[PDB]
Amino acid sequence: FRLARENAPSIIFIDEVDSIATKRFDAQTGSDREVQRILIELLTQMDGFDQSTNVKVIMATNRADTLDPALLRPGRLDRKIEFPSL
Amino acid sequence: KNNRQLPYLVANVVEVVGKAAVVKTSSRQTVFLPMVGLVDPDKLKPNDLVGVNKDSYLILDTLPSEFDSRVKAMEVDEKPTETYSDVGGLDKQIEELVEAIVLPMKRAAPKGALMYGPPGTGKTLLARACAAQTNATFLKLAAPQLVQMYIGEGAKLVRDAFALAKEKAPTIIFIDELDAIGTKRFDSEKSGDREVQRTMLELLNQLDGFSSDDRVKVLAATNRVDVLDPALLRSGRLDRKIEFPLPSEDSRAQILQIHSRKMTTDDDINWQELARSTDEFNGAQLKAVTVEAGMIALRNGQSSVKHEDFVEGISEVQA
Amino acid sequence: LKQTENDLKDIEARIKEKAGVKESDTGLAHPLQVARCTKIIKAKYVINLKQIAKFVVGLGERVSPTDIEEGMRVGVDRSKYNIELPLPPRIDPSVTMMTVEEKPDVTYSDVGGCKDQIEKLREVVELPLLSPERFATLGIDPPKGILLYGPPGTGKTLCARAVANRTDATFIRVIGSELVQKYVGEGARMVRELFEMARTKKACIIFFDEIDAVGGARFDDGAGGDNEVQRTMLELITQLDGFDPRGNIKVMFATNRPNTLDPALLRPGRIDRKVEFSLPDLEGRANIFRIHSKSMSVERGIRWELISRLCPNSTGAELRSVCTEAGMFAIRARRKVATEKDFLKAVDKVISGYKK
Amino acid sequence: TKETVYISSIALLKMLKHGRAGVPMEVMGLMLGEFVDDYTVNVVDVFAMPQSGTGVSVEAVDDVFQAKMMDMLKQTGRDQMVVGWYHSHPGFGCWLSSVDVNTQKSFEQLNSRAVAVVVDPIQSVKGKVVIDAFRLIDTGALINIQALIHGLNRHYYSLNIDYHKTAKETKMLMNLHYEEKEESNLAATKSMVKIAEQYSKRIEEEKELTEEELKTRVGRQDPKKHLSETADETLENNIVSVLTA
Amino acid sequence: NVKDLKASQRVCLRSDSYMLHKVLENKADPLVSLMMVEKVPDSTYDMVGGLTKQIKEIKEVIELPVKHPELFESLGIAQPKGVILYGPPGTGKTLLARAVAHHTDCKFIRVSGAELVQKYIGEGSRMVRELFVMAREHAPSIIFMDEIDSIGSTRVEGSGGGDSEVQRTMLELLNQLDGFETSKNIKIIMATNRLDILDPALLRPGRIDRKIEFPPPSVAARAEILRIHSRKMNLTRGINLRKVAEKMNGCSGADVKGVCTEAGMYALRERRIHVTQEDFELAVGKVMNKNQET
Amino acid sequence: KQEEEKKQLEEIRGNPLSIGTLEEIIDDDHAIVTSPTMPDYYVSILSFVDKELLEPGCSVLLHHKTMSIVGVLQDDADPMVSVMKMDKSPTESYSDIGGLESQIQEIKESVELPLTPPKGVILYGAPGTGKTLLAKAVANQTSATFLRIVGSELIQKYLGDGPRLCRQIFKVAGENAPSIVFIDEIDAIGTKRYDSNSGGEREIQRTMLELLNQLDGFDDRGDVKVIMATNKIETLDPALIRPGRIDRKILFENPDLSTKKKILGIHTSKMNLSEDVNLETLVTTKDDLSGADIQAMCTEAGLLALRERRMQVTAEDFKQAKERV
Amino acid sequence: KRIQSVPLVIGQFLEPIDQNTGIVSSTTGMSYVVRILSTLDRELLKPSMSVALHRHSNALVDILPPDSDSSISVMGENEKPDVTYA
After folding, report:
1. Known consequence of changing residue 131 to Q (chain F)?
2. Does E50 touch chain F (CB under 8 A)?
3. Degrees (nearest 5) of the Cα angle C260, C264, C267?
4. Domain-by-domain residue ranges, chain D?
5. Interface present between G and D (3 or more CB pairs within 8 Å)
6. ∠ at Cα E145 (E144, E146), nearest 5°?
7. Phi/psi class of residue D187: alpha, beta or left (left: φ > 0; alpha: ψ in -120 to 50)?
C-alpha cells in the first residue's frame, strides 16, 4: 500500500475482499486473527491515510456482506459500482 | 582421506545436465554438486540418505536403508508363523483368505482383501496365519498411528509402511479398524479431516498403484468397514470384503478347544454345553471362560480344568 | 597466605578439565539425552538425539576407542544406537520415582469391601505368588497381567498391595505420569529398570497406576510428540509382552478407565484377568474408616460400622473425609475420641459441603 | 618478538588460489623458505597438500608427495626449508587449532621454528588480505620470556609477516592493466555510441542541481556539493573522446 | 561504570570480546494485536463543533484533569481516571475521544475488547497485563477500549459476557488503575450510549470518575458540524446551512460529512468545486436516505 | 590482601565468561549444562564454591571454553522460590478483616484448632474482603510462615519449574516450618483439561500434580496447613481436594449486614465522615455489598467530600460514593 | 569506493544512533551497532530500510529500495494490463 503510494499513482485492487472482510466476531481461534490485523489494517489504512488520490483501493465484490461499513466509511470507500447482468 | 563420518547430514536430490545434482541437507541446505563419485544415479534420488561432506556439501556416501525412520510408532510383524488353527471354526473365510491372498499370491490378482467382523476371533491371527501361510510380511500398523495432526502424515506413514513393508514384500498389510481412516466424509469440508480421507487416499493410490503385486497384501480389519467403494472392493485395491463375525457355537467350541486345549483337565469339560451356554465369543472370551476355568480349576482346587471350571469360566459373567 | 589457594583448586582442574573441555570442543563439541559431537568429517561418531543434525553411529561396526566422540557428551545419547558404545553417557531422571513396596503395610487394610477384586487378585496374584506351580500344573500361569479400574489406589493399589503383602511379594507401583516425562525413553529405561528390577524382585507385583496418564489407545500420536509417549507405551508393551515372567511377577495396571487400554495391553497373554477396583462398601468403609480413625484419636464406643451405615459407597481414600475430618470434631466436640455424630456430622458435613 | 616473515607472493597467491578454492577446508601443505639469521622467515614456496578427506590434521600431512615434488623440485632446483603451516580458516581471526598448533607444534619441531598461517580465504577476497602466522612460544623473546619458563604458553601469538618480490614481476604484474595502440585510444574511443546518454547523462546532471542549489534557502546533500562531483564527472569523460577526433 | 549500568540496558558490547564496548540507550518498540497503542493522535474538537458543551464537559472529565490534574487535587479529589460519553451516536465520536486525547497530549490507545480474554489460556489476559504496561509508559496516555463504546463511531455495542471477563480483568486493571497506580490522566475512555452490557463497577469512579453524557445532538450540532464540513469544501455564496441542517433529521456529525460529500458529489457532478445550497439540502435527503436506509 | 585472594579466584576464571544454565549436576564434579544458545555440555565446576549451592538446570558460571562450570552463578533471575508472598504471623488477623467469622471458624478449626485432622482449606469467594483477608487471618492466628502464591504467578509454561517452583515453595514449607501454605488463583496450573497429550499442557497438571504430590505428601496434627484460593472448583483433582485432607472449602460471600457492619464500622470510621454518616444508614441502603464496596463507599466519600472540598465527609457522599462505588 | 562490494547480506534498517551509526536488522535477525553510508547523510539517510550489510565489516553498505513481495503472499501486479474496456 505504501509501495503503491511509493508507486503513486498506483492501483489497489482486491479479489473478493469479502474473504478477508470476515473477521473475528468472537474468539475465533485459528486463521481468523490475520484478517483481524489485515481487515482492520486497511480499515486503519483507509481511515488512517489522507485523501490525495494517486491510488484507489478497489475490491472485487459479488458479496459485500462480510465487509464492514468501516470500509464503507465515506471518504474511504465512496464509490459502489455494480456489475449488472441483466 | 575421504571416508567417512558418523554420521553425515543427509540430503535429497533434485536433478540427476546428466551429471548434475542438487541436494538439500539434513541441516536443510540446498547445494549443487556434480554428482559425486561414491554415489550412483539410482541411489541418487530425492528423499535420500547421503554421506555428504557437510563442510564441502560434497556427498561423500550414499546412505542406505538405515537408522532411517521406521516410525518407531509403526509396528511390523514379519511373516509371523501362524496357522488357521489359531481361532477355530473360521475356516470359512480362511478359504476366502487363501482365495484372496494365497492363491493370488502363489499364481499369476488383488493387493489385498477387506476384513470385517469382530476380532478376538483372531482376524489378525488369520492375517498372521496368511502372513505365515502365504509367508507374506505381516504389517499391523495402528490406525491410531495413522490418524494425524499433520497434513498427509498418515499418508507418509502409509507411504513408509508401503515401502518399508514392500521392502519386506511379500507382505500382508493388516489395517486395524480401517473405519478410523475409512472416512472421506461426503463433501467439500475436508479441511477439518483431510487425514482420515487423505491417508486412506494415500493407500488407495498405492493400491491404485499396483494390481499384479500379490507380494503386497493390504488386509483391512474392522468389526465392519464403514464406507464401501469399488476401490474398497477392487482387484489391485482391497478386493475382497471378508467377514470375521464372532464364530458359531462349536466353531467356538473349536476355539474353546484351542482354549480348553492347553489346560490340564479332568474331562468334565463339555464344549458344546459351554459353547452353547457361552454365546458368540470372539475366541478369547472362551479363553476368558477358559483362563477363568484354569483359574477356577485352582479355584476349584483342581490342576485339572473341568466343565465346571469352564461353566464357572461361564459363571464369571460372560454377559 | 590466603592469596592464591582457590586457583589450583580450579586453574589446575580448569586446565586439567580444559583437556576434557577441549576434548569436548573438538568438532565444535551421562546424562546424555543428546551427545553433540559435531561435524567431524573424515569420523563424526555421534548419536545426535536432537533436531540439529540428528545422528547415529551404528549400522556397520562403529565405536571409538574410549569415546565415540566429544561434546563432554560422548556416548549413545539416551535413545541407544548400538552398544556401549563408550560406556554410559546416559540417563536422565534420577533413577525411579515409582513405588516399589515389598510386603506393603496393606495386608488387610482397604481389603474391606474389595474382595471380589481381591479374590480375582488371589488367583491372578495370591495363589500364584503362593504357588505358580499349580498353574503350571493347571497348564497356564496366572493371568499374566490384570487390569484394575474404577477408583484408583484408594484401596485399589492397597488391594494390590494387600495380595502383594498377603503373599509378601514385592509390590512395584508405577505411575504412568512418572512414565511420561520430559525426555526420550523416559518410561522405557524405567520400564527397563522396572523389568530389570522386576525379575530381581520376582514373585512381585508390577503395578501401574495411571495408565491413563501414559495414555491408552489413542489417535493422539498424530500430534507427533505423543509418539514418544506411545513409544514408551510401545517400549513397555514391546518389553512387557515377552520377557516378563508372569507366573511370579505380577502385571497390574491401575486406571480410571478400563476401555482406554492400548489394544496391545488387554491382549491375552498380556492382560488376561481384567478387574475393577471394587468400590469400598458399607463394610469396607467401616474398616477403611477404622484404619483412618486409628491415626486420629477416635471413639471406639461408636463403630465405623455405624458411620459407614450412614455413608454411601465411596473411594477408600475419601473415607478419611469420614474419619480424619473429625480430628477437628475430636477437638471441635473436644472429644479426644471423636464420637459417632462427630463422624456422622463429617459424613453430613463433607457430603453436605460436597455438592459436586 | 618483532620477527620478519618473508613470502613469495607466488607462494602467497599459490596458497590463496589453493585457499580461495579451498573453502571449506583449511588448505594444507609445505611452506618453503628459510631463516636468515634470526627473525627472518623466508618463503620461496609452499604447496597444497592434496585434499584431505580427513581434513587438516597433524595426520593428513603426507611427506611423500613433498619429497616427490621436492625431488622434482630438487630436480626443478626447487629447494627450501619447510618453514611452517598455512591454512584457510573461513571467517577465522581467532586462531586456527590448538590441533593446528599441535600440528605445527609437532612440526616446528622439525625447524628451529615454524608458522601456522592463518588465512580466511573468505575475508581474504575483500581486495585487502586477511592472514596471520602463529608460532606460539619464543626463545626468550626478541630477547615472550616469562610464560614459557612459567609454562602454560597459549594464545593466538601471531608472528610479524612480510614478503618481497621484485620490480621484475611487478612489471609483469602491472602488465595487468601492438598493445596500447591496439589497447587504448582506440579501444574505448567508443563514446559517440552513447552521445545520447553522454548528453542525457550530462542532461540529467542539470536537474539534480537546481534541486541541490535550492536548499540554500543542517547537513549534507548540501545545495553546493554533488553539483560539481556530478557536472565534473561528465566533463572529462567527454573530453577524452576529443583525442580520437 | 558498574553503577550507572541498569537492567535491560542497551550497550555496545565489545562484539567478539563480549565485554561492554560502551553503553547505548536502553529502548524498545511499540505493540499491536488490536490493543495497539496510538501515540498522541491528532484531531481537534471544533469539527464536531456545537458539541463543545460535551467537549467542555469532556475537557472537565479529561483535558482539565490532563492539563492540570492538581486543580482537582487542589479540589482534593481523584480526578477522572476514565471517561464516558453518552447520547446520540454517529458524529465522529472518535474525534470527541481523540480531539480531547489529542488536545490532552495523551497516547490514545485502541483496544478491541473481546480479545482481552480468550479460549487460549493466558493469551487473552496477556494483552490485558501488557495493556496495563505500555499504556502508562507514555503517560499521560488516554486509553480507549476498541470494540466496546456505544458512542457509535467506535461502537461494537460492547458485549455482555464476552467483554465482561475482559472488563472483569480490565475493571480489575481499572480498580488497579485505582490501586498503587492511582493513574489519572491515564484514562480508558469508556464512552458509551449503553451502560447495562458493562458492569456497574466501571462507572464506579476511579474507573470513570466524572460521569458525563454527550448530547444532543440536533440540527444545530449538525448545522455547525455542517458549517464545519461545508466550510472546508469550496461553496456557492447564498448558502444557508441551517436550512440544510433544518433539512437534516436523524443525522450525525460524521453523517454530516455525507451531505457535504453528496453536495460535493452533486457539485463535483455540477462541475463545481463550489457548492450551491440546494445540493446540501438535496444531499440531506440523500444522506437522510442512508441515515434511514439500511 | 583478600582482594587478590578473591581476585585470583577470579583470575582463575578468565573472562568475560558465559552465563549458562545447568542441566544435570553430576558428582564427577562435572555436570551437563544448558545454553540458551544450546551448547549443552557435561562439564566441571571450578571448585571453591559448591555444586550444592546450585541445582541441575540452573544458570551457572561457565567459561566460553566448553562452557566449563566456573562456579556458583546466580541466576538471581528469580527469588529463592517461584513467585511468593512470604509472610509469618501475617498482618491480616480475623479482627482486621471485618466479621468473616462464619468461615474464620472454617480456617480456625482446620488450621488453628488442631495445632494443639485435616491439613488445610480451600478459599473461594471474593478477594479483598473474604479470601485475601482470611488468608492471613488464622495464618496469623496460628502465627506460622504464610506463603502466598498465585497460579498466574506460577503459571509456568516451562516443564518442571511449576513443580520445582512449587518445590521451591515446598522447600520453604519444610524448612521454614511452621509454614502456612497459601495458594492463590489457580485457573491455569490447576485445570487438568481432558488429556495428557495433543495440546493440553502437562505442566498444568505436572505443576499441580506434583504440587499435589507434595500436597498429598503431608497431613498434620494442626502444625503445618495448606490453603487453596481460587474461583474454579472442578478444574482441580479430587485427590487435590482429597476429602479428608482438605475438607474445608472456604467460599466467601458478601459480608452480611452485621459482618458488613463490622467491615463497615471498620472501614466507615476509617474514612472521615460526618456523624450524619452512620452504619445502619450505610448498612440499609446496600444490596449486601462486598467488604470492598463497604470500604469503597468510604474511600470515595473522602474524595466526594474532597469534591465538596471537605475532609469531614457528609452522609450523602458515602451514599453517593457507595451508589457510585 | 571499493569498500563497497556485492556479496552482501540483507537486513532491515531500524534506527540510527547517529550519523554513520545505527541499529538495523539482519536477515539473521542480528541487530548491532554498525556503520552505514558515509555516502548518505541525514536527508540522504532513510530511517527504516531493507539494507545492505557487509558480513564481517558487518555494517550498512546501502539501503535497499523498498522490498515488496514477502508473505503476506505478494500483491496483484499487472503492469500495463492487457485488457481494453468495451
Report:
1. 73% loss of ATPase activity
2. no
3. 100
4. 2-163, 178-245
5. yes
6. 110
7. left
